């Protein structure tokens, strides 16, 4: 609800397996709340991408995303350094609802049948040797 | 010298034994006035390394009035195992010289001490002045007065 809808994108349109949910993307603006408030009585741009569900239940998961929040707010007044992602997701209909996309999916699922191997390979070939500076950093982040 | 402390393990084996061979071969270097400074500098820059973060990133450092650069360790005890590796060949090169020519180093020594950028730091550590304050010591030799009598 912090953001400003601009155009559809026309050809992004790809259902999934499975009740017929399909995805789609939007090129949106985010200006913030009170300014949105105040603009919608009158009349810094990236892409987002939108998972639609029909017949499912979301509702747990918004109590689970309260409370990873929570605990994100939690870790970051104490001081500590931990890494987690809060996606947002509103339920509208009976069994109907709005799952937003993290920017940049990649499954594990895919990645294991594209290589049928362990990650470390994976992150061998992708980064280099353990020597790099690079390969640190990706596992301090994976600590994280 | 700025290639000792290299990341890999036979890169600074070869440096070793290169710069054994160079400086046996060519004695008159111990006493240079250009080398003490540079590998005092440099053992300043590695002590100031020892504690700075490591989980902070950019280990790379410049050596002051030389265009270089020496990367580091992650891990703490892999720097101090190559910092303490390193401060012994300073010593040995220094009593090296000291036993020759005792005035012309003896000299150098003195005019090190008399920059006025490492007065203001000199509050801290500043392991350089230490290890030359410390290795003026133990290498003296006696004076005129003293230098022919029998025991």
């Given at each position: ?144 | ?131 030359a304050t410390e290795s003026i010591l133990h290498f003296a030799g006696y004076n005129k007065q ?6």
């Amino acid at each position: 609800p912090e953001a400003i809808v601009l155009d559809i994108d026309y050809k992004s349109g790809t259902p999934m397996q499975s009740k017929a949910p399909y995805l789609a993307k939007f090129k949106v603006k985010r200006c913030g709340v009170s300014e949105l408030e105040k603009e919608g009585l009158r009349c810094k741009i990236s892409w987002q991408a939108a998972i639609f569900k029909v017949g499912d239940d979301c509702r747990q998961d918004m109590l689970a995303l309260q409370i990873i929040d929570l605990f994100k707010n939690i870790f970051q007044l104490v001081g500590l350094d931990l890494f987690v992602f809060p996606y947002r997701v509103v339920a509208t209909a009976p069994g109907c609802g709005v799952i937003e996309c993290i920017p940049d999916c990649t499954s594990r699922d895919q990645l294991g049948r594209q290589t049928d191997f362990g990650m470390y390979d994976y992150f061998t070939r992708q980064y280099g040797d353990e020597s790099t500076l690079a390969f640190q950093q990706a596992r301090y982040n994976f600590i994280r | 010298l700025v290639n000792f402390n290299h990341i890999h393990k036979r890169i600074r084996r070869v440096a070793d034994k290169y710069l054994s061979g160079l400086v046996d071969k060519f004695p008159h270097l111990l006493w240079s006035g250009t080398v003490l400074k540079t590998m005092l500098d440099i053992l300043q820059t590695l002590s100031l390394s020892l504690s700075a973060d490591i989980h902070k990133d950019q280990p790379y450092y410049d050596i002051p009035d030389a265009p270089y650069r020496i990367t580091v360790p992650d891990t703490y005890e892999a720097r101090e195992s190559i910092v303490k590796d390193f401060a012994a060949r300073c010593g040995m090169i220094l009593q090296e010289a000291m036993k020759w020519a005792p005035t012309v180093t003896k000299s150098h020594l003195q005019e090190y001490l008399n920059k006025h950028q490492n007065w203001v730091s000199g509050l801290s550590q500043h392991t350089g002045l230490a290890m030359a304050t410390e290795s003026i010591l133990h290498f003296a030799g006696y004076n005129k007065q003293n230098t022919t009598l029998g025991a």
